[PDB]
Paper text:
The polypyrimidine tract-binding protein ([name]) is an important regulator of alternative splicing. [name]-regulated splicing of α-tropomyosin is enhanced by [name], a protein with four [name]-[name] interacting motifs (PRIs) that bind to the helical face of the second RNA recognition motif ([name]) in [name]. By fusing [name] PRIs as N-terminal extensions to [name] [name], we have now obtained crystal structures of [name] [name] complexed with [name] PRI3 and [name], which are high-affinity and low-affinity motifs, respectively. Strikingly, although our NMR-restrained docking model assumed an extended conformation of the bound peptide, the core peptides of PRI3 and [name] in the crystal structures adopt S-shaped conformations that wrap around the peptide-binding surface on [name], which is formed by the α1 and α2 helices as well as the β1-α1 and α2-β4 loops.
PRI3-[name] and [name]-[name] crystals diffracted X-rays to 1.4 Å and 1.55 Å, respectively. In each case, only central portions of the PRI sequences were revealed by difference electron density maps (PRI3: VSLLGAPP; [name]: SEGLLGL); there was no density for the linker peptides connecting them to the [name] domain, so these were not incorporated into the atomic models. For PRI3, the four-residue sequence 3LGAP6 wraps around Tyr 247, whereas in [name] a different backbone conformation means that just three residues, 3LGL5, are in contact with the tyrosine. Moreover, although in PRI3 Pro 6 and Pro 7 both contact the side chains of Tyr 247 and Tyr 193, the equivalent residues in [name] (Gly 6 and Pro 7) are not visible in the electron density map, presumably due to disorder; this difference is likely to contribute to the lower affinity of [name]. In this conformation, the peptide is able to make four hydrogen bonds to [name] [name]. In contrast, [name] (core sequence: GLLGLGP) makes only three intermolecular hydrogen bonds. The absence of Ser at position 1 eliminates the intrapeptide hydrogen bond and results in a more open backbone conformation. The loss of this internal interaction allows the peptide bond between Leu 3 and Gly 4 to flip with respect to PRI3, a conformational change that eliminates a hydrogen bond to [name] (from the carbonyl group of Gly 4), which likely reduces the affinity of this motif, although the peptide flip is also needed to allow the 3LGL5 sequence to wrap around Tyr 247. In contrast, there was a stronger 4-fold enhancement of binding when the double mutation Leu5Ala/Gly6Pro was used to convert the 3LGLGP7 sequence in [name] to the 3LGAPP7 found in our modified version of the high-affinity PRI3 and in PRI1. Although [name] exhibits an alternative mode of binding, which inserts a hydrophobic Leu side chain (from position 5 of the motif) within this Tyr pocket, this is insufficient for high-affinity binding.
Residue numbers in the entry:
A (entry chain A): 180 to 284
B (entry chain C): 682 to 688
């Protein structure tokens, strides 16, 4: 069981920030790190919980759910990554356990 | 298609 989830937000008709993902996923556990990126022309993210069960719970509860009315559908799967490496704290990545990280470069 | 949060 992996504590890291791979997330794709489809039908992105309104901006979804890293902080909004933190808000939504924090309901199911302690979010340690989040990194967002664009691939295959889709907004995606990797999110790490402290507990693999929290990841499982979030996937069951949130997969296929819209973040906002009529848009921003979450597609969630487990990642084989056992943890995440975050270099910076900014709009694209965040390590909630390391407030000392630079925002870039 | 309701959402988790409001706008």
């Amino acid at each position: 069981q992996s504590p890291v989830l791979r997330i794709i937000v489809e039908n992105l008709f309104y901006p979804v920030t890293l902080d909004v993902l933190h808000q939504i996923f924090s309901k199911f556990g302690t979010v340690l790190k989040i990194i967002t990126f664009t691939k295959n022309n889709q907004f995606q993210a990797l999110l790490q919980y402290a507990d693999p069960v929290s990841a499982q719970h979030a996937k069951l509860s949130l997969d296929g759910q819209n973040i906002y009315n009529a848009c921003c559908t979450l597609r969630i799967d487990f990642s084989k990554l056992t943890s995440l490496n975050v270099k910076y704290n900014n709009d694209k990545s965040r390590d909630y356990t390391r407030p000392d990280l630079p925002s870039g470069d | 298609s309701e959402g988790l949060l409001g706008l």
